[model samples]
Target: IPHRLVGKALYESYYDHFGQMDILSDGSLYLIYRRATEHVGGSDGRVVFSKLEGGIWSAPTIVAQAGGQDFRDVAGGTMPSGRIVAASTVYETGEVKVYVSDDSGVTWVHKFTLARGGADYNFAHGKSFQVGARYVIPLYAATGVNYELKWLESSDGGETWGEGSTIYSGNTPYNETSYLPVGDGVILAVARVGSGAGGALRQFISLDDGGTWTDQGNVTAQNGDSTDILVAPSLSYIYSEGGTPHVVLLYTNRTTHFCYYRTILLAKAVAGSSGWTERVPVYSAPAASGYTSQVVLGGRRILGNLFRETSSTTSGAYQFEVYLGGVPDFESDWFSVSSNSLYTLSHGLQRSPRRVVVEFARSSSPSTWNIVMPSYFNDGGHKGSGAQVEVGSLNIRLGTGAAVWGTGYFGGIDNSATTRFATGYYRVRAWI
Candidate 1:
């Protein structure tokens, strides 16, 4: 696993956290996260989406927004028909809303609503999984008494939903449930047992879909929270061979320093093990809060959706990581160039295989610094078949001047440069 920094999404006043990432059937990726300046009650939900075209992430676009109401526990997945479904809890109302987009998240509608019966808060934090044509979502609601994980389902492609059965009920609240469907009618469910000082990680298994659940036991001994689990076969890569499937679990472990300070841990369940293996530290930073979502990338490598808060003074940023042999391999920031007053930018590195990015020092309008292009880019690995740098603009206007809305121009390698353009922080990326 090559642990290199994929990139960070920076927000000014609002901090980004609790990020969930999903890949559509068409290979497009979507990220849903909560951002707010105030930690307690002013958070809002938002989503950014990108597609891999010719080895690079296309410019991201904000596809959905939850205004006014605080959105928490956001989880989303792509349906069989290429539709995207995002489920989030409205923290203020204790209601769960399912948003859907048939056109790849370009437009969305409040497709389904999960009614709340009790007064306490509810979280639609569990991931949506497809089992044999039926979609299962492990939504939990807090009852003043306890937190209960409810299994909800949609048979006809997420257009409608039925209030399904209950999977887990305990005096200690279980928050943020995640499960993986094993064989026929079998699932491995994981959830956070408590919050704050009482935090721990627990697991349960359901043999008859959601009919009944048996405790598979705890991954941590009252020392962790924010747990997520999945079967290894479902990942993008296969690391083991045999009849039995391996299990991968993730959670945030509380440290000795502070009650709220936490470290991210990754643990695996051996095929014949009685319980999960000892958890290993995957990420940690002082005074930083962490939340994660995982996906299997190209080579069965696990990619973690990492959000970190390094300090209170700076805004939080979102990052990506890859796990290798249960350990994280973060990408290196090889090159960074500051914009010279004119068009040229410089970096300090020998001629080698490198990924280069050029961004503006500050935001500029379409007229100020238009037509930015890479004047020099090269990697010694390609050994002179002729390395040519290509330039492209970020936005484009369609048709004539009368009717025009800025639809994004997918950046590409144009051998010759063209001038009609808009500029700000345009990115010029070249990689081998």
Candidate 2:
């Protein structure tokens, strides 16, 4: 695996959320965020920035402000011209303004105001993306039930923008939506719908750019089923393979918080097709706080900036962490193993430990092939009972809790073996 796999999101602040990051042409980490003394509805909220220089964060500089309004919802992106175009939504006016910084981020000036028409609350959430030469930003609004999501697109490399038409609208709210452009004009998007911290993520698609979009139903998970409420959905479109684009999603399930078990998860899906896969708890409970904004870091890597463990701090302490997520590069073929033996699946990439993520599978019945995460024994009361997995060396030591890699496991059986016989095996897939 390549060394981009972080296995966890970088916790950037205990209180900051909805910030944006963009890579500079010279390969520096340029990011913008809301600096607020109060998280919820503070008048002092403003947009500020910092870049990673010399392996350290330079002192933050204020970017833009909304005259007399509180700049709460902040977002910015890098364009083709190396200019950073930023947009922010203020709480008072519920309006969005685009700002551009041509000479790095040392200076920024207003480009345009997204004032074609909107509701009382407008949002410029999600990082910006490029489709061919056009850049798209995900924006949504609501005034009571008049909620709708639209695309704020720029075709001239952020020189100008078009207030895109409504992609989806209804009495049901669609807030904090994110988008990724696949090939052609097809754009894949995810949404947080319903009310009262209500509902889960859903999928939408537009094959003709932002010409029109159709609801493709829920996101295909427990959270997608409304059984669990999820929010702060962010996405990175990795690449296209087998006629579909793959995406990595970051979402939060804050059922209980403040060390009472809040969760932020990472999941993958083929755009508009297989739905979301079984989510991995990228940032775990017992204190994980706030929304995640995931941005593509070029190549097979992505970065998610969510707040850190809130339980670690008291009334006034919060920090930041940057998590690097890598798309899988190699998937080893199914290898049989014995419950009494250790197995080594060679990736041949010779990557460091953090670059690998492992998945295990076993079968007892023809109807089901049990799959599980890189779980060890006891496992937060874990499942798919494997004992230990050390990735740096890439080895697995099975435990008695797991069945032997014998017959009675199913992984696409062949011929007469398809009906009653189940073949037992565990395959490995790693991220580089």
Candidate 3:
């Protein structure tokens, strides 16, 4: 799946893209986020939704309206019973409302509310999850005296809520708490202590579901201020078909200042026996634009909806825009070629071959590989066993024979020596 323009200027308004995504059981995707006409916290914001079904995406529609009030910090996900649940804070009323959609997303009904008072901020910005028929969500207030990370539990499918234990409590403040349920009555949460380049990104883990939490460690690399971590953490189980199951975390990180995201990076992590592996970058924005939503689109392919503010001077036309990006699964794309003597190394975008990079590898053999680009490649290159060659198209055969590396308009190789053998990866810039 190559990166594509799913929608352009989809919503003509100022969007505080705390975007949320969920894949339904019937193979439909519900993208929920907030949109308004201002950048500040107190704006006439509303919760809107878009549906992706039958290879087509519908335009944005109002699923949960604030009713002339201000709404922000939106989050939600699909339930086990096929119902869509969403939550957002009404800034004017100083309360949070949860809405559930029974008939997919065409209609919604108010399920309940959370954290209602004179407090400034109240609502669980992070997505909620179900554990053993129990629903759990987190809510906090940064300005009020009761500034602590508190969670809500629902035994009857998000209808009523009973207050649960605090995930993090401090005299100062903590906001934007996001967590993932990794099965077996376990949950992992990440939070921000403050704002700017000095804010601390802390981690907390739960052993008995959302009933209890313990401080784990800090994500030192993500120390940027305004770390708008994904409120909806998409957890997927991979590698289980061939071996052990690894819990993969997919989300976005944005460091912003002065109401704009300076650096927006797409990152992923795999949970291991000890803890989560280091966060790995998948993509980056060229300029300041904050927040993104992730959706796992089957077999080593993923989709992301990134927010890009086209202009700095906030106006009617240059407020904000969103785009869709497609990413390939680099880990799962490594497969064995014929004869099983060597494996063909490859990596690139999912849909097109223009940016595809190919290589060859063996554990013990100190060998290189050759790749034959398609006829569409006009400006391409390669390395190692062969030099730049200009040809129409030929099947550069490789079976039990040695491999060669070439460079032209196709792509280039990034080679390095491993402890056992030599290995490298390749990348393509453009296809057509």
Candidate 4:
């Protein structure tokens, strides 16, 4: 499917840079964009919200006066009590603030602000969600200086506030933060790690309302250098469907031009499981950089939306469009198998088709194992397609090629040769 234009431009206009989308409970969309002038002048901008009425989206109405400066860049869903909440840094003071809208995107009230300010804070880009009676916001420190995440609390409708605690702290700058409802007032924080460039992407976990954290370790691409495309990983959505809990991450991979491609990541977080598994890539593209929002359509089916740019000229002079969709299954993990020799030690001297995988457990040395394909002396009784009793090759990789082990062999996931070894004995090993 075309991963390009599926919706209107979240940041429409020549210099109007847009990003960070949040969908309200009533099916309306909210986004934060930079409202730039023809030449130099802008606020981080404010919430530009629109609604779907009778198959048409009306023009977006400003959520609130953006305080003459960019404060909130990221937003959250409407609360259970029917209030919309959002977060941003006060450009004038660098204080983190949360705003609320009661009349549905038309007006907003400054509800809360950081007790402490400055130190390059950007919580507006991460996950800010509501769970039952409480709200969980995932804020990360900005680059140039390491910053720790600070969380806050408010009951009685943002009227009063309490001193919050620290979340993530270390050398690496933590970006976007997302959480999933786990039960008994407990939430799971799924976060992304980065140096604001491509390298290793790490996921962290928090259980105590952002007071303490535990690293979940690396979950996506690793062993690469920092690039704009591989910059800060942003966790957007985390929820369950069909007895399965899944999380979505919106990210960009840098391109040659000033732009970068966007990606939608999916992960399965099973209950009672220590860590998330099944890291899958769902979408990829170029000239797209920004926030993504996800919603459940059917059981185990996902519908997501993000902004992207496309142009006739490679230098990005044309208009771009925002997109959305229910991502299909489109990820492939490489598996490999190799062996030294095969002679057939079991049922009728034949080898079986076994699953070959590249395991990290054997990182110490190169792994190689083997089994010989069935072979026999041919006679004058040959009939079907010039029969040779020895099938010769028995192992296959999904999209690559088949390796016929003359004595030993190696096969991988990128191969497409279909040669399933018969039922016998086989040995295999892999070096990660």
Question: In order, what lDDT does every prediction score?
Answer: 0.50, 0.57, 0.51, 0.42
**TM-scores, in order shown?**
0.61, 0.67, 0.61, 0.61
lDDT of 3 by residue, 376-426 (tens): 211233223321222112211222211222223332352322111123322
Question: Where is model 3 more than 4 Å wrong at Cα?
Answer: 1-16, 54-56, 115-120, 143-146, 220-237, 247-279, 286-288, 297-301, 312-432
lDDT, residue 216, candidate 4: 61
* Candidate 1: tens digits of C-alpha lDDT, residues 1-432: 233336644444556555566676766555655555545554655544444344354554564556776766567677778887777777778777777778886777777777787537556764577877788666777788776888677899888987776887668767667777654876667666656344345667667877787876664322233333211111222232221134555555444212121111122231221333334455553344555566665434555554556556344444455444422211111122222212322221223214443332223222232233333322322111111232223211111111011112325432322311222244333322
Top lDDT model = 2
Predicted candidate 4 versus true structure: per-residue lDDT over 186-217, tens digit per residue: 45554445534443455555555455666665
lDDT of 3 at 8: 28
Global CA lDDT computed for model 1: 0.50
Report the Cα lDDT for candidate 4.
0.42
- Global Cα RMSD, each model: 19.9, 10.8, 11.3, 9.7
In each prediction, how many residue pairs overlap at the backbone (N, C-alpha, C within less than 3 A)? 8, 14, 18, 22
Cα distance off (Å), candidate 2, residue 426: 9.7
